[PDB]
Design a protein around this ligand. Structure first.
Ligand SMILES: CSC[C@H]1O[C@@H](n2cnc3c(N)ncnc32)[C@H](O)[C@@H]1O
Ligand SMILES: CSC[C@H]1O[C@@H](n2cnc3c(N)ncnc32)[C@H](O)[C@@H]1O
Ligand SMILES: [Zn+2]
Ligand SMILES: [Zn+2]
Lengths: 436, 436
């Protein structure tokens, strides 16, 4: 028998742009999409659970291709400052004082409860204390990529580049054979990582077959300083070092010339587009249309909650679509179907799992969400694709499944204790503000 | 005795940027803010109703300085098209077929239910069938500015400019003496209104002491075509015609040179900044920082739901703050307090009522909202100003009052039947799509 049969008014498949099935149902077995059939035919099949969702659209879960989940604990602590001031006087001293395993576990859990509430099923994270993020990911049941961050300078976590690498690999080894947990190597950025460290990352990722997750070309300063320090722009340096290949997920990628767009396409890297962070930090506008036109997989991330300050992939997908139009001055840039593909199947492509998740197709894993469109905010309901991108909100996600397992049902979290998350956040408020 | 006493964890006054009162209470009588006092002192005062809101922030209601509320019925009907295509083949034929009193009343009600749900207390609207919008506004209890639209060409409503004017004035006369309902003159835009019609508007608005509400400098085409047709850019033309003065609310104001910023400041007009519409229609980025630095009141509107496609002033305020930073490449542009002021007190200034609404001050009318910040999306709760702008969402508004009267209580609409609104929207879906 099937484990579940979920019927819905609409299903946005993401198999082809614009495809929406009406009054169909998804049958699930072994954690995968077993059949996609007319809801009429579903009524007479055996299932452990049946669920009927009138006025809901079912769609693949959203894939947040770039986060720093534990920074949820720093959400709105300091805003609207010059960047040097914000980092030097607020963020870094706070991290130095507070970031240990406890902070990372609590902050990751808090982020995961927020992400699930908004229909995010996969997170591509990168932070410190990788065992804590992994523990949080297995607790939540999200599809989790834990990014083992690598920096040259000392932090609470590790003392130098070789130490970040060793500790990350050691923690990875405690979590082997977990289907929903994948460790990646995460050299932080070209301006915090030396040539020799990049070489070690290239060698290691090749030996162990790991993804590389790195902030690249976020700011004009980064790109201009690279030339003075390394004699060439960061992408050209990384090409020389062997970093550009299909295993690389390049976050931000804001400042690109046309030669660099072609470079990305030729090496098959993917990018994570982080529009709110790029706007809030005044980084600029990533040329996502150029990138996608060149054949590059452009997914969407939220970045950290201290520069967003939401972890809302629906809002981020809408912002990607809006920012693309104002940046190109073309109202046809990044149409709703394209934005949905960025938020789902492109994230899967970036992560090397597009054969397994990212669209509603038989044989793929059942990473799905349902949104209730019977609200004023999405009335009248003409076309669910348009509404998902331009009108629907995080509050309308009613159900979330990852590999067919319910993580949220009628907005009740099933794997995390929402009260506990609020209490951890409240504790951190007192600890960070020195209130008792 | 007081009519109400509302205590809250935080009160953002908007009297001074950054001012937040902790554990205070608002006492209300005769529809006005009668006292702002420590919550401890409140417990021993007589009140018809007392309300306690732990973990909520109270703040002035949001003022949507530019809407076309009835277009809520066209939300997501057609998206991502070239502008000429969108208007010529989808929006205008649909309006021509469907827009009568019924459409305007139903669509206005639907918009008003969505606006109240998101903490909007005042709407500066402009559409056709002004009596229908007025009837809807009195039904909802929102503070409503009904904009009597004026165009040269015939529509279902009126046949020529003098006809729009006559019919608008006739409908205005049926709604006299209503404290929360104000009619304005709304010549649509420089490219749809003749010199002679602008002159008639100037004369009439002066005789009757009315606001003028007009789309100005939205697109590069508008501004460039003006020179060929009228020999000068639209603002200079409108200055020559007598249109620029403190009674003018100029919507959009995207394409401005520095001389035009100074022109606006010298004539005391206000602007309505509509970031989502300007992005979605690829109009450009209004230089709001320049305008505010020159002393111009810049408020925020959503425009119509067909080019947003939300009527969510929280999301619009956040977008204003984000777009300002990416447009200036300065992360300190439009800080959270400034964005809140744009969404509240600047809207009041534009509408000539800043002595009456827009901030939490004794003697002002009690147009207030409460947001519940005890959600993961706004945890940890460091500073409510930052959260209101960068993290909080429309779903967190729990209570709305206009002139001290509850329009929404624990997210239950008190003046509108939410089921009825959904049903009207559903009816319009069938009518517009030709389904039965
Ligand atoms: C893995 S995301 C980057 C992490 O390293 C921190 N970080 C990045 N650059 C610096 C720097 N120059 N000094 C201190 N901390 C840094 C950031 O605040 C974040 O915690
Ligand atoms: C009062 S907002 C503008 C209204 O007039 C309509 N409109 C504006 N310009 C034109 C035009 N050139 N032809 C037809 N309708 C128009 C818009 O679709 C909207 O309903
Ligand atoms: Zn990042
Ligand atoms: Zn408008």
């Amino acid at each position: 028998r099937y484990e579940k049969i979920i019927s819905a008014r609409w299903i946005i498949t993401v198999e082809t742009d614009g495809e929406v099935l009406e009054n169909h149902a998804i049958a699930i077995r072994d954690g995968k999409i077993a059949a996609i059939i007319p809801a009429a035919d579903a009524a007479g099949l055996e299932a452990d659970e049946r669920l009927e969702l009138p006025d809901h659209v079912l769609m693949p879960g959203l894939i947040n291709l770039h986060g720093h989940s534990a920074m949820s604990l720093l959400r709105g602590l300091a805003d609207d400052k010059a960047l040097m001031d914000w980092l030097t006087n607020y963020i870094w001293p706070t991290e130095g004082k507070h970031v240990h395993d406890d902070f990372v576990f609590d902050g990751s859990l808090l982020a995961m409860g927020e992400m699930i509430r908004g229909g995010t099923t996969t997170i591509n994270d990168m932070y410190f204390y990788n065992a804590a993020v992994a523990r949080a990911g297995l607790a939540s049941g999200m599809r989790t990529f834990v990014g083992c961050s690598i920096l040259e300078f000392p932090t609470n976590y590790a003392s130098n580049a070789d130490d970040y690498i060793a500790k990350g690999m050691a923690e990875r080894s405690q979590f082997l054979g977990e289907d929903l947990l994948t460790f990646t190597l995460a050299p932080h950025a070209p301006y915090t990582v030396s040539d020799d460290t990049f070489r070690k990352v290239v060698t290691l990722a090749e030996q162990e077959d790991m993804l590389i997750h790195c902030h690249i070309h976020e700011t004009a300063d980064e790109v201009n300083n690279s030339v003075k320090e390394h004699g060439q722009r960061p992408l050209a340096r990384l090409q020389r070092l062997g970093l550009l290949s299909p295993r690389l997920v390049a976050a931000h990628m804001v400042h690109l010339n046309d030669a660099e767009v072609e470079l990305a396409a030729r090496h098959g890297l993917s990018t994570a587009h982080n529009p709110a962070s790029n706007m809030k930090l005044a980084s600029g506008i990533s040329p996502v249309s150029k990138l996608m036109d060149a054949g590059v997989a452009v997914g969407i991330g939220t970045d950290g909650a201290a520069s967003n300050n939401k972890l809302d992939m629906l809002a981020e997908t809408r912002l990607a679509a809006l920012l693309a139009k104002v940046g190109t001055l073309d109202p046809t840039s990044v149409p709703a179907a394209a934005a949905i593909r960025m938020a789902t199947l492109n994230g899967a492509r970036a992560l090397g799992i597009a054969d397994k998740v990212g669209s509603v197709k038989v044989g793929k894993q059942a990473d799905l969400i349902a949104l209730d469109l019977a609200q004023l905010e999405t009335a009248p309901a003409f076309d669910p694709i348009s509404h998902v991108v331009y009108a629907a909100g995080r509050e309308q996600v009613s159900h979330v499944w990852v590999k067919g397992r319910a993580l949220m049902r009628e907005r009740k979290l099933t794997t995390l204790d929402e009260s506990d998350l609020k209490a951890r956040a409240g504790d951190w408020r007192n600890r960070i503000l020195a209130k008792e």
